[PDB]
Design a binder for this molecule. Structure first.
Ligand SMILES: *[C@@H]1O[C@H](CO)[C@@H](O[C@@H]2O[C@H](CO)[C@@H](O)[C@H](O)[C@H]2NC(C)=O)[C@H](O)[C@H]1NC(C)=O
Ligand SMILES: CC(=O)N[C@@H]1[C@@H](O)[C@H](O)[C@@H](CO)O[C@H]1O
Ligand SMILES: *[C@@H]1O[C@H](CO)[C@@H](O)[C@H](O)[C@H]1NC(C)=O
Ligand SMILES: [Br-]
Length: 425
Protein backbone atom coordinates (compact mmCIF):
# COMPACT_ATOMS: atom_id res chain seq x y z
CA UNK A 1 0.00 0.00 0.00
CA UNK A 2 0.98 3.67 -0.22
CA UNK A 3 2.71 5.80 2.38
CA UNK A 4 1.69 9.26 1.16
CA UNK A 5 4.00 12.17 2.00
CA UNK A 6 2.62 15.69 1.77
CA UNK A 7 5.15 18.34 0.82
CA UNK A 8 4.58 22.00 1.58
CA UNK A 9 7.64 23.85 0.28
CA UNK A 10 8.49 26.53 -2.29
CA UNK A 11 7.69 24.69 -5.56
CA UNK A 12 8.63 27.45 -8.07
CA UNK A 13 10.92 29.86 -6.21
CA UNK A 14 14.45 28.38 -6.29
CA UNK A 15 16.17 30.80 -3.92
CA UNK A 16 15.41 29.22 -0.50
CA UNK A 17 17.70 26.58 1.06
CA UNK A 18 14.54 24.44 1.33
CA UNK A 19 13.25 25.26 -2.20
CA UNK A 20 11.80 22.24 -4.05
CA UNK A 21 14.54 22.58 -6.72
CA UNK A 22 17.04 21.50 -4.04
CA UNK A 23 14.93 19.43 -1.66
CA UNK A 24 13.14 17.49 -4.42
CA UNK A 25 16.32 16.01 -5.96
CA UNK A 26 17.45 15.21 -2.38
CA UNK A 27 14.12 13.51 -1.63
CA UNK A 28 14.48 11.50 -4.85
CA UNK A 29 17.90 10.25 -3.80
CA UNK A 30 16.37 9.26 -0.45
CA UNK A 31 13.54 7.33 -2.08
CA UNK A 32 16.04 5.51 -4.34
CA UNK A 33 18.04 4.38 -1.33
CA UNK A 34 14.77 3.12 0.27
CA UNK A 35 13.66 1.34 -2.92
CA UNK A 36 17.01 -0.54 -2.89
CA UNK A 37 16.46 -1.75 0.69
CA UNK A 38 13.57 -4.30 0.70
CA UNK A 39 13.98 -4.64 4.48
CA UNK A 40 12.50 -1.13 4.75
CA UNK A 41 8.78 -0.32 4.71
CA UNK A 42 7.69 -3.97 4.14
CA UNK A 43 4.64 -3.83 1.86
CA UNK A 44 4.54 -0.02 1.63
CA UNK A 45 5.55 2.32 -1.22
CA UNK A 46 6.31 6.00 -0.46
CA UNK A 47 4.42 8.35 -2.81
CA UNK A 48 4.74 12.14 -2.80
CA UNK A 49 2.05 14.81 -3.19
CA UNK A 50 3.11 18.45 -3.58
CA UNK A 51 1.61 21.77 -2.50
CA UNK A 52 3.20 25.20 -2.52
CA UNK A 53 3.92 27.53 0.37
CA UNK A 54 4.22 30.51 -2.05
CA UNK A 55 1.77 33.43 -2.37
CA UNK A 56 1.02 35.14 -5.73
CA UNK A 57 4.19 37.27 -5.32
CA UNK A 58 6.27 34.06 -5.29
CA UNK A 59 7.44 34.18 -1.66
CA UNK A 60 6.71 31.66 1.12
CA UNK A 61 3.62 32.87 2.99
CA UNK A 62 1.89 32.47 6.35
CA UNK A 63 -1.35 32.03 4.36
CA UNK A 64 -0.56 30.05 1.20
CA UNK A 65 1.13 27.27 3.22
CA UNK A 66 -1.68 26.35 5.70
CA UNK A 67 -4.20 26.66 2.83
CA UNK A 68 -2.06 24.15 0.86
CA UNK A 69 -1.63 21.81 3.87
CA UNK A 70 -5.41 21.75 4.37
CA UNK A 71 -6.02 20.94 0.68
CA UNK A 72 -3.39 18.16 0.68
CA UNK A 73 -4.82 16.78 3.94
CA UNK A 74 -8.37 16.53 2.50
CA UNK A 75 -7.36 15.21 -0.92
CA UNK A 76 -4.67 12.67 0.06
CA UNK A 77 -4.90 11.81 3.77
CA UNK A 78 -1.06 11.93 4.05
CA UNK A 79 0.71 9.85 6.66
CA UNK A 80 3.27 12.65 7.21
CA UNK A 81 4.17 16.23 6.23
CA UNK A 82 7.49 17.31 4.76
CA UNK A 83 8.20 21.02 5.26
CA UNK A 84 7.49 23.94 5.40
CA UNK A 85 10.95 25.55 5.68
CA UNK A 86 10.08 29.22 6.37
CA UNK A 87 9.34 30.12 10.00
CA UNK A 88 6.29 32.05 8.83
CA UNK A 89 4.94 29.11 6.84
CA UNK A 90 5.91 26.50 9.44
CA UNK A 91 4.23 28.21 12.41
CA UNK A 92 0.59 27.86 11.20
CA UNK A 93 1.15 24.50 9.41
CA UNK A 94 2.65 22.88 12.52
CA UNK A 95 -0.35 23.83 14.67
CA UNK A 96 -2.62 22.16 12.07
CA UNK A 97 -0.55 18.96 11.87
CA UNK A 98 -0.47 18.80 15.68
CA UNK A 99 -4.26 19.05 15.76
CA UNK A 100 -4.49 16.30 13.15
CA UNK A 101 -1.95 14.23 15.13
CA UNK A 102 0.02 13.79 11.90
CA UNK A 103 3.85 13.98 12.06
CA UNK A 104 5.62 16.90 10.34
CA UNK A 105 9.29 16.66 9.26
CA UNK A 106 11.44 19.66 8.47
CA UNK A 107 15.05 20.77 8.20
CA UNK A 108 13.98 24.39 8.26
CA UNK A 109 11.84 26.12 10.93
CA UNK A 110 14.77 27.04 13.20
CA UNK A 111 12.72 29.53 15.28
CA UNK A 112 12.47 29.18 19.05
CA UNK A 113 8.64 29.05 18.99
CA UNK A 114 8.62 25.75 17.06
CA UNK A 115 10.56 24.15 19.92
CA UNK A 116 7.48 24.40 22.15
CA UNK A 117 6.41 20.83 21.36
CA UNK A 118 3.26 20.92 23.53
CA UNK A 119 1.96 23.20 20.78
CA UNK A 120 4.10 21.77 17.96
CA UNK A 121 3.32 18.13 18.70
CA UNK A 122 4.85 15.55 16.36
CA UNK A 123 7.14 18.15 14.74
CA UNK A 124 10.60 16.69 14.18
CA UNK A 125 13.37 19.10 13.18
CA UNK A 126 16.28 17.43 11.38
CA UNK A 127 18.11 20.61 10.41
CA UNK A 128 19.54 23.33 12.64
CA UNK A 129 17.52 25.37 15.13
CA UNK A 130 18.45 28.64 16.77
CA UNK A 131 18.53 27.51 20.43
CA UNK A 132 21.39 25.25 19.37
CA UNK A 133 23.37 28.41 18.62
CA UNK A 134 22.60 29.43 22.20
CA UNK A 135 24.27 26.17 23.27
CA UNK A 136 27.33 27.08 21.21
CA UNK A 137 27.58 30.58 22.72
CA UNK A 138 27.08 29.08 26.20
CA UNK A 139 30.07 26.77 25.59
CA UNK A 140 32.25 29.61 24.21
CA UNK A 141 31.63 31.81 27.25
CA UNK A 142 32.44 28.98 29.66
CA UNK A 143 35.65 28.19 27.78
CA UNK A 144 36.82 31.82 27.67
CA UNK A 145 35.63 32.98 31.13
CA UNK A 146 32.97 35.48 29.99
CA UNK A 147 30.27 35.36 32.67
CA UNK A 148 28.73 38.85 32.92
CA UNK A 149 27.80 40.67 29.73
CA UNK A 150 27.31 40.51 25.96
CA UNK A 151 25.81 42.76 23.29
CA UNK A 152 23.93 41.58 20.17
CA UNK A 153 23.37 43.73 17.07
CA UNK A 154 21.15 42.48 14.26
CA UNK A 155 19.43 43.50 11.05
CA UNK A 156 17.08 42.06 8.42
CA UNK A 157 15.73 42.84 4.93
CA UNK A 158 12.60 44.98 4.39
CA UNK A 159 10.08 42.52 5.86
CA UNK A 160 10.26 38.76 5.39
CA UNK A 161 11.24 35.62 7.34
CA UNK A 162 13.49 37.93 9.40
CA UNK A 163 16.33 35.37 9.75
CA UNK A 164 18.46 37.53 12.08
CA UNK A 165 15.62 38.42 14.42
CA UNK A 166 14.91 34.68 14.91
CA UNK A 167 18.61 33.89 15.28
CA UNK A 168 18.96 36.48 18.06
CA UNK A 169 15.64 35.52 19.70
CA UNK A 170 16.91 31.93 19.82
CA UNK A 171 20.41 32.87 21.01
CA UNK A 172 19.15 35.28 23.69
CA UNK A 173 16.65 32.94 25.36
CA UNK A 174 19.03 29.96 25.53
CA UNK A 175 22.05 31.97 26.68
CA UNK A 176 20.03 33.72 29.41
CA UNK A 177 18.74 30.39 30.63
CA UNK A 178 22.15 28.70 30.99
CA UNK A 179 24.58 31.54 31.87
CA UNK A 180 22.49 34.17 33.72
CA UNK A 181 24.44 36.93 31.88
CA UNK A 182 23.14 40.33 30.79
CA UNK A 183 22.44 40.28 27.06
CA UNK A 184 21.88 43.72 25.53
CA UNK A 185 20.38 43.83 22.08
CA UNK A 186 19.81 46.41 19.40
CA UNK A 187 18.11 46.20 16.01
CA UNK A 188 19.11 48.30 13.00
CA UNK A 189 18.22 48.70 9.31
CA UNK A 190 21.16 48.03 6.97
CA UNK A 191 20.72 50.68 4.25
CA UNK A 192 20.19 53.48 6.75
CA UNK A 193 23.21 55.69 7.62
CA UNK A 194 21.19 57.22 10.50
CA UNK A 195 21.53 53.95 12.45
CA UNK A 196 25.33 53.86 12.58
CA UNK A 197 25.78 56.52 15.29
CA UNK A 198 23.60 54.49 17.68
CA UNK A 199 25.29 51.20 16.75
CA UNK A 200 28.77 52.56 17.50
CA UNK A 201 27.53 54.28 20.66
CA UNK A 202 25.99 50.95 21.83
CA UNK A 203 29.22 49.01 21.10
CA UNK A 204 31.11 51.54 23.24
CA UNK A 205 28.69 51.52 26.17
CA UNK A 206 26.74 48.26 26.15
CA UNK A 207 29.33 45.49 25.70
CA UNK A 208 32.82 44.22 24.90
CA UNK A 209 31.87 40.73 23.70
CA UNK A 210 29.77 41.65 20.63
CA UNK A 211 27.62 39.49 18.30
CA UNK A 212 26.48 40.84 14.93
CA UNK A 213 23.86 39.22 12.68
CA UNK A 214 23.87 41.02 9.33
CA UNK A 215 24.95 40.88 5.70
CA UNK A 216 28.73 40.50 5.07
CA UNK A 217 28.92 44.14 3.93
CA UNK A 218 27.20 45.53 7.04
CA UNK A 219 29.65 43.60 9.20
CA UNK A 220 32.67 44.95 7.26
CA UNK A 221 31.37 48.48 7.51
CA UNK A 222 30.85 48.21 11.26
CA UNK A 223 34.35 46.78 11.70
CA UNK A 224 35.89 49.64 9.71
CA UNK A 225 34.00 52.12 11.89
CA UNK A 226 35.03 50.27 15.08
CA UNK A 227 38.70 50.50 14.04
CA UNK A 228 38.51 54.19 13.22
CA UNK A 229 36.95 54.77 16.65
CA UNK A 230 39.92 52.99 18.30
CA UNK A 231 37.88 49.93 19.29
CA UNK A 232 40.40 47.09 18.94
CA UNK A 233 41.01 43.40 19.73
CA UNK A 234 42.45 44.29 23.16
CA UNK A 235 39.11 45.38 24.61
CA UNK A 236 36.62 44.07 22.07
CA UNK A 237 35.78 40.91 20.16
CA UNK A 238 33.26 40.94 17.31
CA UNK A 239 31.48 37.73 16.40
CA UNK A 240 29.79 37.65 13.03
CA UNK A 241 26.77 35.36 13.28
CA UNK A 242 26.77 34.10 9.71
CA UNK A 243 25.35 30.62 9.99
CA UNK A 244 25.28 29.90 6.26
CA UNK A 245 28.75 31.43 5.73
CA UNK A 246 27.82 34.17 3.26
CA UNK A 247 30.87 36.24 4.07
CA UNK A 248 32.97 33.27 2.93
CA UNK A 249 33.61 31.45 -0.38
CA UNK A 250 33.02 27.71 -0.93
CA UNK A 251 34.96 24.88 -2.64
CA UNK A 252 38.13 26.97 -2.20
CA UNK A 253 40.65 24.21 -1.50
CA UNK A 254 43.94 25.97 -0.76
CA UNK A 255 42.81 29.49 -1.76
CA UNK A 256 42.87 31.47 1.52
CA UNK A 257 39.65 33.07 2.81
CA UNK A 258 39.88 36.86 2.97
CA UNK A 259 36.32 38.01 3.89
CA UNK A 260 37.63 41.54 4.56
CA UNK A 261 38.61 41.98 0.89
CA UNK A 262 36.72 44.19 -1.58
CA UNK A 263 39.28 46.02 -3.74
CA UNK A 264 37.48 49.19 -2.62
CA UNK A 265 40.61 50.98 -1.33
CA UNK A 266 40.01 49.90 2.28
CA UNK A 267 41.42 46.37 2.29
CA UNK A 268 44.45 47.18 4.49
CA UNK A 269 42.16 48.92 7.02
CA UNK A 270 39.65 46.06 6.77
CA UNK A 271 42.36 43.45 7.45
CA UNK A 272 43.45 45.48 10.48
CA UNK A 273 39.82 45.77 11.60
CA UNK A 274 39.14 42.01 11.19
CA UNK A 275 41.90 41.15 13.71
CA UNK A 276 39.14 41.81 16.25
CA UNK A 277 36.59 39.74 14.33
CA UNK A 278 35.67 36.04 14.39
CA UNK A 279 33.04 34.28 12.25
CA UNK A 280 30.42 31.79 13.49
CA UNK A 281 29.00 29.38 10.90
CA UNK A 282 27.31 25.98 10.79
CA UNK A 283 29.85 23.13 10.57
CA UNK A 284 30.54 21.86 7.07
CA UNK A 285 30.07 18.06 7.21
CA UNK A 286 33.43 16.41 6.39
CA UNK A 287 32.41 12.72 5.92
CA UNK A 288 32.80 11.18 2.40
CA UNK A 289 29.08 10.33 1.95
CA UNK A 290 28.31 14.06 1.92
CA UNK A 291 30.64 14.88 -1.00
CA UNK A 292 29.04 12.00 -2.86
CA UNK A 293 25.58 13.38 -1.98
CA UNK A 294 26.56 16.81 -3.37
CA UNK A 295 27.79 15.21 -6.62
CA UNK A 296 24.52 13.31 -6.98
CA UNK A 297 22.34 16.25 -5.89
CA UNK A 298 23.92 18.60 -8.49
CA UNK A 299 23.39 16.17 -11.37
CA UNK A 300 19.77 15.42 -10.46
CA UNK A 301 18.82 19.07 -9.86
CA UNK A 302 20.19 20.09 -13.26
CA UNK A 303 18.54 17.18 -15.04
CA UNK A 304 14.99 17.05 -13.55
CA UNK A 305 14.53 20.37 -11.72
CA UNK A 306 16.16 22.77 -14.19
CA UNK A 307 18.51 24.20 -11.51
CA UNK A 308 22.19 24.81 -10.75
CA UNK A 309 23.12 23.91 -7.16
CA UNK A 310 26.02 26.04 -5.93
CA UNK A 311 28.48 24.89 -3.31
CA UNK A 312 27.80 26.34 0.12
CA UNK A 313 26.69 25.73 3.69
CA UNK A 314 23.06 26.11 2.51
CA UNK A 315 23.26 22.57 1.07
CA UNK A 316 23.10 21.07 4.58
CA UNK A 317 19.35 21.81 4.50
CA UNK A 318 18.41 19.52 1.56
CA UNK A 319 20.81 16.88 2.97
CA UNK A 320 19.03 17.08 6.30
CA UNK A 321 15.71 16.71 4.51
CA UNK A 322 17.27 13.64 2.89
CA UNK A 323 18.48 12.29 6.22
CA UNK A 324 15.22 13.24 8.03
CA UNK A 325 13.17 11.31 5.48
CA UNK A 326 15.38 8.23 6.02
CA UNK A 327 15.22 8.54 9.81
CA UNK A 328 11.42 8.70 9.46
CA UNK A 329 11.40 5.67 7.09
CA UNK A 330 13.45 3.69 9.66
CA UNK A 331 11.08 4.67 12.50
CA UNK A 332 7.97 3.61 10.52
CA UNK A 333 9.69 0.27 9.73
CA UNK A 334 10.41 -0.34 13.43
CA UNK A 335 6.78 0.53 14.16
CA UNK A 336 5.49 -1.90 11.53
CA UNK A 337 7.74 -4.66 12.95
CA UNK A 338 6.15 -4.40 16.40
CA UNK A 339 2.47 -4.48 15.34
CA UNK A 340 1.88 -0.79 14.60
CA UNK A 341 0.86 0.99 11.39
CA UNK A 342 2.04 4.04 9.41
CA UNK A 343 -0.55 6.45 10.83
CA UNK A 344 0.62 5.89 14.43
CA UNK A 345 2.19 9.37 14.65
CA UNK A 346 2.99 9.36 18.37
CA UNK A 347 4.72 5.97 18.23
CA UNK A 348 6.67 6.89 15.04
CA UNK A 349 7.79 10.23 16.52
CA UNK A 350 8.98 8.63 19.80
CA UNK A 351 11.28 6.41 17.73
CA UNK A 352 12.89 9.45 16.05
CA UNK A 353 13.28 11.56 19.21
CA UNK A 354 16.29 11.01 21.48
CA UNK A 355 17.99 8.96 18.77
CA UNK A 356 21.17 8.57 16.72
CA UNK A 357 21.27 7.99 12.98
CA UNK A 358 23.82 7.79 10.13
CA UNK A 359 23.13 9.82 7.00
CA UNK A 360 24.86 11.88 4.31
CA UNK A 361 25.30 14.71 6.88
CA UNK A 362 27.22 12.28 9.11
CA UNK A 363 26.31 11.41 12.66
CA UNK A 364 23.03 13.02 13.68
CA UNK A 365 21.36 13.11 17.04
CA UNK A 366 17.76 14.17 17.55
CA UNK A 367 17.41 15.42 21.15
CA UNK A 368 14.61 14.61 23.64
CA UNK A 369 12.66 17.61 22.36
CA UNK A 370 12.73 16.36 18.74
CA UNK A 371 15.40 18.80 17.52
CA UNK A 372 18.68 17.88 15.87
CA UNK A 373 21.92 18.61 17.68
CA UNK A 374 23.73 21.20 15.56
CA UNK A 375 27.47 21.50 15.04
CA UNK A 376 29.21 24.88 14.62
CA UNK A 377 32.59 26.18 13.43
CA UNK A 378 34.46 29.25 14.66
CA UNK A 379 36.65 30.97 12.06
CA UNK A 380 39.36 33.51 12.91
CA UNK A 381 42.38 35.26 11.33
CA UNK A 382 45.94 34.06 10.86
CA UNK A 383 47.73 37.29 11.97
CA UNK A 384 50.61 36.49 9.60
CA UNK A 385 48.51 36.14 6.38
CA UNK A 386 45.20 37.86 7.20
CA UNK A 387 43.46 34.65 6.10
CA UNK A 388 40.46 33.17 7.96
CA UNK A 389 40.14 29.51 8.86
CA UNK A 390 38.27 27.15 11.18
CA UNK A 391 40.09 27.07 14.55
CA UNK A 392 37.29 25.56 16.72
CA UNK A 393 34.52 23.01 16.21
CA UNK A 394 31.53 22.47 18.46
CA UNK A 395 29.80 19.14 18.76
CA UNK A 396 26.13 19.84 19.54
CA UNK A 397 25.65 16.48 21.29
CA UNK A 398 28.70 16.27 23.58
CA UNK A 399 28.72 20.09 23.88
CA UNK A 400 32.51 19.89 23.40
CA UNK A 401 34.72 22.54 21.83
CA UNK A 402 37.72 21.03 20.02
CA UNK A 403 40.74 22.72 18.47
CA UNK A 404 40.99 22.28 14.69
CA UNK A 405 44.27 21.45 12.88
CA UNK A 406 46.10 22.20 16.16
CA UNK A 407 45.30 25.93 15.72
CA UNK A 408 45.16 28.42 18.58
CA UNK A 409 42.46 31.10 19.08
CA UNK A 410 43.90 34.46 18.01
CA UNK A 411 44.09 37.23 20.61
CA UNK A 412 46.31 40.34 20.14
CA UNK A 413 47.36 40.22 23.81
CA UNK A 414 47.48 36.40 23.88
CA UNK A 415 44.37 36.16 26.09
CA UNK A 416 40.71 37.12 25.40
CA UNK A 417 39.45 40.53 26.50
CA UNK A 418 37.38 40.62 29.69
CA UNK A 419 33.61 40.94 29.05
CA UNK A 420 33.52 43.86 31.51
CA UNK A 421 36.19 46.60 31.11
CA UNK A 422 38.39 47.27 34.15
CA UNK A 423 36.87 50.75 34.65
CA UNK A 424 33.20 50.09 33.85
CA UNK A 425 31.22 50.97 30.72
C1 LIG B 1 11.82 34.18 -4.69
O1 LIG B 1 11.94 34.54 -3.33
C2 LIG B 1 12.63 35.74 -3.05
C3 LIG B 1 12.50 36.01 -1.56
O2 LIG B 1 13.09 34.95 -0.85
C4 LIG B 1 12.02 36.90 -3.83
O3 LIG B 1 12.84 38.02 -3.70
C5 LIG B 1 12.20 39.47 -2.39
O4 LIG B 1 11.09 39.93 -3.13
C6 LIG B 1 10.40 40.98 -2.47
C7 LIG B 1 9.15 41.30 -3.30
O5 LIG B 1 8.37 40.14 -3.45
C8 LIG B 1 11.36 42.17 -2.25
O6 LIG B 1 10.77 43.27 -1.56
C9 LIG B 1 12.60 41.68 -1.48
O7 LIG B 1 13.52 42.72 -1.23
C10 LIG B 1 13.26 40.55 -2.27
N1 LIG B 1 14.44 40.03 -1.58
C11 LIG B 1 15.45 39.33 -2.12
C12 LIG B 1 16.27 38.52 -1.16
O8 LIG B 1 15.72 39.33 -3.32
C13 LIG B 1 11.93 36.60 -5.31
O9 LIG B 1 11.26 37.65 -5.96
C14 LIG B 1 11.18 35.29 -5.53
N2 LIG B 1 11.22 35.00 -6.95
C15 LIG B 1 10.17 34.56 -7.65
C16 LIG B 1 10.42 34.28 -9.11
O10 LIG B 1 9.05 34.37 -7.18
C1 LIG C 1 26.90 9.33 23.24
C2 LIG C 1 26.88 8.95 21.79
O1 LIG C 1 25.90 9.24 21.09
N1 LIG C 1 27.95 8.30 21.34
C3 LIG C 1 28.15 7.93 19.95
C4 LIG C 1 28.33 6.43 19.76
O2 LIG C 1 27.22 5.74 20.27
C5 LIG C 1 28.53 6.15 18.27
O3 LIG C 1 28.66 4.76 18.04
C6 LIG C 1 29.73 6.96 17.73
C7 LIG C 1 29.99 6.71 16.25
O4 LIG C 1 30.29 7.92 15.58
O5 LIG C 1 29.51 8.34 17.99
C8 LIG C 1 29.41 8.59 19.39
C1 LIG D 1 29.67 14.34 18.65
O1 LIG D 1 29.65 13.82 19.96
C2 LIG D 1 28.79 12.70 20.03
C3 LIG D 1 28.54 12.32 21.49
O2 LIG D 1 29.71 11.82 22.10
C4 LIG D 1 29.40 11.57 19.20
O3 LIG D 1 28.45 10.55 19.11
C5 LIG D 1 29.62 12.00 17.78
O4 LIG D 1 30.34 11.00 17.10
C6 LIG D 1 30.34 13.34 17.72
N1 LIG D 1 30.29 13.82 16.35
C7 LIG D 1 31.33 13.68 15.54
C8 LIG D 1 31.13 14.10 14.11
O5 LIG D 1 32.41 13.23 15.92
BR1 LIG E 1 8.46 26.94 2.99
Amino acid sequence: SDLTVAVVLPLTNTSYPWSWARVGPAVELALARVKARPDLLPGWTVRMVLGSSENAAGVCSDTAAPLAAVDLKWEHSPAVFLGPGCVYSAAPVGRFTAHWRVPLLTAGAPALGIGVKDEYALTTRTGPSHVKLGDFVTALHRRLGWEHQALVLYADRLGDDRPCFFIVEGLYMRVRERLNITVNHQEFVEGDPDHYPKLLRAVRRKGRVIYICSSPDAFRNLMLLALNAGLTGEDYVFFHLDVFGQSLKSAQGLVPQKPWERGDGQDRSARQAFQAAKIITYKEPDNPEYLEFLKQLKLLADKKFNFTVEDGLKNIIPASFHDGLLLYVQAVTETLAQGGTVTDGENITQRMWNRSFQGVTGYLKIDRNGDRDTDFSLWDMDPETGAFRVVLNYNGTSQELMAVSEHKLYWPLGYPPPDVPKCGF
